[PDB]
mmCIF file of C-alpha atoms and ligand atoms in Angstrom:
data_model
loop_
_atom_site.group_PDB
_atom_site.id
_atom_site.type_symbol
_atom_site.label_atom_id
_atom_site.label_comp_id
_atom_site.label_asym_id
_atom_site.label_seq_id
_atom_site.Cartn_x
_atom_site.Cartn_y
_atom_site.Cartn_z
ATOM 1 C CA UNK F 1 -17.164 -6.186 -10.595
ATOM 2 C CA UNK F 2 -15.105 -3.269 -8.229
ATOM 3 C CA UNK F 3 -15.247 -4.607 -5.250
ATOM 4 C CA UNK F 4 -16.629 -2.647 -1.725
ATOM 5 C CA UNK F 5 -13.241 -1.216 0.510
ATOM 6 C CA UNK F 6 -15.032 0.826 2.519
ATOM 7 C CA UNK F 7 -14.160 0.341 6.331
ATOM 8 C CA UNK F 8 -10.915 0.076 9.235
ATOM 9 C CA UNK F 9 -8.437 -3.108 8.523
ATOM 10 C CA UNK F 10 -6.038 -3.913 11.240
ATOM 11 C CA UNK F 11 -2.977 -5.741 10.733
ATOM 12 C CA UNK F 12 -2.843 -9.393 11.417
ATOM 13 C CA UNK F 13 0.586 -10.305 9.725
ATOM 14 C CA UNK F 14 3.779 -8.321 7.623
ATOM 15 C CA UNK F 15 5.774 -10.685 5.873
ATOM 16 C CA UNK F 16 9.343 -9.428 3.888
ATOM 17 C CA UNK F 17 8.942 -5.888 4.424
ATOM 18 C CA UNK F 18 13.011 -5.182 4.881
ATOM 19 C CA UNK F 19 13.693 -6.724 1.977
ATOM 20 C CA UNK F 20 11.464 -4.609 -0.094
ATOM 21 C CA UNK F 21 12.611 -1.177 1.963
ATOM 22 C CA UNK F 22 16.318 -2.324 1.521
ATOM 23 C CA UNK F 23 15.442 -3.055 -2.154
ATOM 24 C CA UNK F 24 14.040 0.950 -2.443
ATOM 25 C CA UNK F 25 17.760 1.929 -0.676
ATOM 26 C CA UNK F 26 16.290 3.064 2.866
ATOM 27 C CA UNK F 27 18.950 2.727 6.062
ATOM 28 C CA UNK F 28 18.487 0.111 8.504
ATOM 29 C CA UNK F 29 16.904 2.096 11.158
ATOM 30 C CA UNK F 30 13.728 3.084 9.133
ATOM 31 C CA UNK F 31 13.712 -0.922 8.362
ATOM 32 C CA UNK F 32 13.564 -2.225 11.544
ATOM 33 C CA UNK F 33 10.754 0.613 13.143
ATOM 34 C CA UNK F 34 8.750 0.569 9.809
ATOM 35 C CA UNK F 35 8.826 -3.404 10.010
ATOM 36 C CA UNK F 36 8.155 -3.277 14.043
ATOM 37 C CA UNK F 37 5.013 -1.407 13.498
ATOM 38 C CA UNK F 38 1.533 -2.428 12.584
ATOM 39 C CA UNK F 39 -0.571 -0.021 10.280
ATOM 40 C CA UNK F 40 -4.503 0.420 10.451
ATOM 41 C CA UNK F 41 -5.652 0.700 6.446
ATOM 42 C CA UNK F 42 -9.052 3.171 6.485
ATOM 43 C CA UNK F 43 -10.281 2.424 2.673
ATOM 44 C CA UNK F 44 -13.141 4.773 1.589
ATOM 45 C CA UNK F 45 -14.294 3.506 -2.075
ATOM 46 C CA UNK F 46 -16.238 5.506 -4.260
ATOM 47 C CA UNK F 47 -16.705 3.495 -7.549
ATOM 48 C CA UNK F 48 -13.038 4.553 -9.110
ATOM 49 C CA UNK F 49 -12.464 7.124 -6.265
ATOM 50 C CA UNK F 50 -10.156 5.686 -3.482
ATOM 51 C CA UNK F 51 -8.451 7.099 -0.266
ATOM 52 C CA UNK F 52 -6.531 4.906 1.080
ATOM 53 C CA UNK F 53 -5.309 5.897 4.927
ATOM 54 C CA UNK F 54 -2.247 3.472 6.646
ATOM 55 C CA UNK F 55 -2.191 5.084 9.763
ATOM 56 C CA UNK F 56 0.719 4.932 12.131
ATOM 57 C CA UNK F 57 2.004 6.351 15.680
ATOM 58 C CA UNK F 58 5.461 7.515 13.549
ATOM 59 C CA UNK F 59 3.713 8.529 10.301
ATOM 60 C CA UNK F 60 0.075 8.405 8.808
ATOM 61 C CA UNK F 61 0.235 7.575 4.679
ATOM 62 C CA UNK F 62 -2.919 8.889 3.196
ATOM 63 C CA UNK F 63 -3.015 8.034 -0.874
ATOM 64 C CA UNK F 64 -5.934 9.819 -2.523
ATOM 65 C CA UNK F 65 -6.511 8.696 -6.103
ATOM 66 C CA UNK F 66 -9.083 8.043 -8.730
ATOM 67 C CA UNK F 67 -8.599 4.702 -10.627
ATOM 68 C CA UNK F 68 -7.821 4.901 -14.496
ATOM 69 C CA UNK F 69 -5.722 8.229 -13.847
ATOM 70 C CA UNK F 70 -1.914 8.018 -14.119
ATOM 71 C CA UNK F 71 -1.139 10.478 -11.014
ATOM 72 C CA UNK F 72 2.014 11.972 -9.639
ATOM 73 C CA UNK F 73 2.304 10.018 -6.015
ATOM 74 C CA UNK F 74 5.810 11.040 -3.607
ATOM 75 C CA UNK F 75 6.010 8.311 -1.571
ATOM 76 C CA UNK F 76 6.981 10.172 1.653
ATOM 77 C CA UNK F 77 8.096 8.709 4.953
ATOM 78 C CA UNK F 78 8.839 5.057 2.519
ATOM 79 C CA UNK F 79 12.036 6.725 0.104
ATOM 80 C CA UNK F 80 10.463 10.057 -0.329
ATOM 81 C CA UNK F 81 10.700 9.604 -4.429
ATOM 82 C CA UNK F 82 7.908 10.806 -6.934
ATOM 83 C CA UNK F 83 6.341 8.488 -9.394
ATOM 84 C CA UNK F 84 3.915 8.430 -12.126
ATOM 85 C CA UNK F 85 1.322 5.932 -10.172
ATOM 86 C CA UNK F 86 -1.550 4.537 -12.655
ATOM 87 C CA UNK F 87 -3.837 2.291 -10.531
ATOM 88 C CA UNK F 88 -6.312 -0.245 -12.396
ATOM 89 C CA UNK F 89 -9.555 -2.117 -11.372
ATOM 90 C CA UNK F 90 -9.461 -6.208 -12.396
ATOM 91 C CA UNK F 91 -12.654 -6.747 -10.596
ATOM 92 C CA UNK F 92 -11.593 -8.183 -6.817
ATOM 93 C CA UNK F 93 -7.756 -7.452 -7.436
ATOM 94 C CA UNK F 94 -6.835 -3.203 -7.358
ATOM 95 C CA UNK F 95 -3.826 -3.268 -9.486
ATOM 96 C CA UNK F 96 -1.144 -0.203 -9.431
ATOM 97 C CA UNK F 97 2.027 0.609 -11.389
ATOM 98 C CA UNK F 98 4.344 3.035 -9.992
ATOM 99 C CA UNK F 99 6.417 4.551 -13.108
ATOM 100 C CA UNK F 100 9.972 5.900 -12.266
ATOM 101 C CA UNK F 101 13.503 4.300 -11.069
ATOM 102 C CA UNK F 102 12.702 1.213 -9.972
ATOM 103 C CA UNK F 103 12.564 -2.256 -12.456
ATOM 104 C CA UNK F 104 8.765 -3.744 -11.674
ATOM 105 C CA UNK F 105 7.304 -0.961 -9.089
ATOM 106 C CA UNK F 106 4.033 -1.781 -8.031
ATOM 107 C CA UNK F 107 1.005 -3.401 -5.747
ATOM 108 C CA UNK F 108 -1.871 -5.693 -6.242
ATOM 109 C CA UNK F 109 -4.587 -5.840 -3.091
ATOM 110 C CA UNK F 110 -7.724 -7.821 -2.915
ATOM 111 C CA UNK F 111 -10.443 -8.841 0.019
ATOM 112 C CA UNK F 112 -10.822 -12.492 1.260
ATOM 113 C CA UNK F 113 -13.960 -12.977 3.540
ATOM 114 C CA UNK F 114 -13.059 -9.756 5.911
ATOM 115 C CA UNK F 115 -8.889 -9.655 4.943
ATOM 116 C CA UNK F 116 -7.569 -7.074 2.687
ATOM 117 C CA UNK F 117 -4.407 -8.993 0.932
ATOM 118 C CA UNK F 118 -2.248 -6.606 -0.219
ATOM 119 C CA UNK F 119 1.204 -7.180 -2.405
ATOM 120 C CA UNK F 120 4.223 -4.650 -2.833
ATOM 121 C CA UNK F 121 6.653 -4.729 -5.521
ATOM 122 C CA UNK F 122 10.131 -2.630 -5.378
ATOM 123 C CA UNK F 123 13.026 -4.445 -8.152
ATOM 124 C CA UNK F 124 11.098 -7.953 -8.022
ATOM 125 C CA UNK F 125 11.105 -8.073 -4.044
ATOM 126 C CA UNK F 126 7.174 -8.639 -3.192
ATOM 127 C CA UNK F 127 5.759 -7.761 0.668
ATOM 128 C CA UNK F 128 2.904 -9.317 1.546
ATOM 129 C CA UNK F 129 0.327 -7.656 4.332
ATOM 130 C CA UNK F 130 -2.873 -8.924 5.679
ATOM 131 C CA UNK F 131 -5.328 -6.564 7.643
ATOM 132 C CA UNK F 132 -9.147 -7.707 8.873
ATOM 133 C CA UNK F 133 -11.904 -5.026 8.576
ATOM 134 C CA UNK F 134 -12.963 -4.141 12.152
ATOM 135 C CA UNK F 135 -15.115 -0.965 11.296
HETATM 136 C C1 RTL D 201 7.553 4.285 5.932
HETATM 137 C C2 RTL D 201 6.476 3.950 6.954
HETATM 138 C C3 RTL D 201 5.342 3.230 6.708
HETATM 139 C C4 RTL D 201 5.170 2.618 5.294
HETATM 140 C C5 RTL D 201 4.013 2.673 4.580
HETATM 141 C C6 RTL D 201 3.735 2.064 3.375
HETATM 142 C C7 RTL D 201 4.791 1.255 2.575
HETATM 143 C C8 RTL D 201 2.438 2.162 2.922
HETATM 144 C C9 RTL D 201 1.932 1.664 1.757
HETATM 145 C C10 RTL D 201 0.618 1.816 1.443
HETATM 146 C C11 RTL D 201 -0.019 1.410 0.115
HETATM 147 C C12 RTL D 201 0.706 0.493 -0.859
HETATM 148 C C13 RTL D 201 -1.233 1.937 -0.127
HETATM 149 C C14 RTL D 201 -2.085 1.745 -1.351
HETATM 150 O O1 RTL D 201 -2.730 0.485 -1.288
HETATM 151 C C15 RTL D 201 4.256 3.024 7.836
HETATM 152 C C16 RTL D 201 3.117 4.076 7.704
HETATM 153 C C17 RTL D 201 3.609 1.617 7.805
HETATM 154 C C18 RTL D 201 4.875 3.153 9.271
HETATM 155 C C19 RTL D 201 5.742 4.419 9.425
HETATM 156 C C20 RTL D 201 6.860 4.443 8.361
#
């Protein structure tokens, strides 16, 4: 059953988030502002329609995808690389491969109660983010 995103998360916690941006090959600047700041997530859901919005002071990351389609995604303000990005529904968990130079690219994210838990991949290196849905 896809379950309903639609709403404003705010960030409650971001755990090993220079480890996965060191892991991608960014400098240590970009590392220590990116992990410093605290993202609002506006999801709007539309069955397999998705636009996800993490919105930031320094940069604003709007992915707009349907689910099933294998779409070209450059990952700009993170590395700035392009991959083939195929994101899947298994019921609560939205499940995404990103294909291109990177051994296990990827994210999983999933509601508990009001908390979006979301999961990035980059070379095995998983960070973990937790935002509650405010509007
Ligand atoms: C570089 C960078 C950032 C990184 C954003 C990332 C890594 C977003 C990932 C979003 C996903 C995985 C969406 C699909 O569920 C943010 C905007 C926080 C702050 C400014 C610099």
């Amino acid at each position: 059953m896809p379950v309903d995103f639609n709403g404003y998360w705010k960030m409650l916690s971001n755990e090993n988030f220079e480890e996965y941006l060191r892991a991608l090959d960014v400098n240590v600047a970009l590392r220590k502002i990116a992990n410093l700041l605290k993202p609002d997530k506006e999801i709007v859901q539309d069955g397999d329609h998705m636009i996800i919005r993490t919105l930031s002071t320094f940069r604003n990351y709007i992915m707009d995808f349907q689910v099933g389609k294998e779409f070209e995604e450059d990952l700009t303000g993170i590395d700035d690389r392009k991959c083939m990005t195929t994101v899947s529904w298994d019921g609560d968990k939205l499940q995404c491969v990103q294909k291109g130079e990177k051994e296990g690219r990827g994210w999983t994210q999933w509601i508990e109660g009001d908390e979006l838990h979301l999961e990035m991949r980059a070379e095995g290196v998983t960070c973990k983010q937790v935002f509650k849905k405010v509007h």
